[PDB]
Paper text:
Actin is one of the most conserved and abundant eukaryotic cytoskeletal proteins and plays a key role in cell motility, division, polarity, and muscle contraction. Actin organizes into two helical strands, which undergo continuous polymerization and depolymerization. In addition, a subset of β-actin undergoes a process termed arginylation in which an arginine residue is added to the N terminus. N-terminal acetylation of actin, mediated by the NAA80 enzyme, plays important roles in actin polymerization and depolymerization kinetics and affects cellular structures such as filopodia and lamellipodia. β-actin arginylation, which is achieved by the arginyl-tRNA-protein transferase Ate1 following the removal of the N-terminal acetylated aspartic acid residue, has been proposed to regulate lamellipodia formation, cell size, and cell spreading, but the exact biochemical and structural mechanisms are unknown.
Author numbering: 1 to 374
Write the structure that this text describes.
Amino acid sequence: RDDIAALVVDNGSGMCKAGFAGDDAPRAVFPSIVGRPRHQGVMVGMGQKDSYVGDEAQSKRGILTLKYPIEHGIVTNWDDMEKIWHHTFYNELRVAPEEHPVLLTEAPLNPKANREKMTQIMFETFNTPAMYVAIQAVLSLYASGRTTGIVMDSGDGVTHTVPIYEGYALPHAILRLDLAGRDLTDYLMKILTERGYSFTTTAEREIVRDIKEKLCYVALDFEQEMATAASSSSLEKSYELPDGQVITIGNERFRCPEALFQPSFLGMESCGIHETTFNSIMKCDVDIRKDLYANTVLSGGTTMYPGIADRMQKEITALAPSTMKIKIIAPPERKYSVWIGGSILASLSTFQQMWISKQEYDESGPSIVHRKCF
Ligand SMILES: Nc1ncnc2c1ncn2[C@@H]1O[C@H](COP(=O)(O)OP(=O)(O)O)[C@@H](O)[C@H]1O
Ligand SMILES: [Mg+2]
């Protein structure tokens, strides 16, 4: 192309969003999975591919051992992370990472190794002209187009809360909760053994992930929901497995997401999503707090339960004083927020100087990022 518009990769733990820089929607939304087949291949018909990264794994999941390369925001296996990125440019976008500049997001307080290796790989593997690393929550604020607010983003394995006032991070106040979507999925598996459905296989876990999205919804009052669910069959809901069996679910649909509000359930002693937002406000200075309580942005995937926005409001309200009324942004496209906001930052002028360049890296090595990025 005459104009090369830098790639925005929002590499998360659960998915791998990507696209060109010119739009408010990615082109490339495929779950970050490498499938390895787990039997002898008897037929000599075709030489089947040894590995099945990307959406193909979701179709062939029956005979595969699906694995996740990124757990808790952190890249446990790179060989698998390289395979996902090769698929991202060559197959998903059909573009060259050398004839295009590129920006990769990352959750805060990740071990310094993560940033370092990302920098090496973007320069040594795909030989990128220029690269950058950004924090998720700062970009989610860009998307909502507000200079000041507190951003609470929960994805699949990391939940983080970052408070910004008049375009100034207070980084002493940035809290992070491990509890996230994967912990919610894995708790539904554990409470569907109640009604006697077992999901031991990797692929079985992915079927559970799809029930949670279809039926799980947060409740204003947990106790009142529980009483009604026990009293009557109104709540009960029924889903068709891939075999053609039916599973019926009742109270389990509003207990999958309740763990967020009381991690006592999952076994952790973390306070809540509501107490984490509150406490990040209350580490900030007195004057800044009034503007923050007013603006509270929900971002990401596990912010997409119905009920969630109405539960947060009520929750923080009780914690806060009678004045300083709290309003929660909870936008419609919050699922792709982080990426859309990454679209803008690259689009925005004066971000050019900030871009790390091969030239700089060649002198100071991968450790360049530890001084040129936040
Ligand atoms: N409609 C939905 N309702 C509830 N949770 C959802 C929904 N869609 C996806 N999820 C959750 O969102 C996570 C993926 O969202 P996202 O934040 O975009 O990904 P990542 O953490 O990889 O960036 C999954 O773990 C899943 O639990
Ligand atoms: Mg995310």
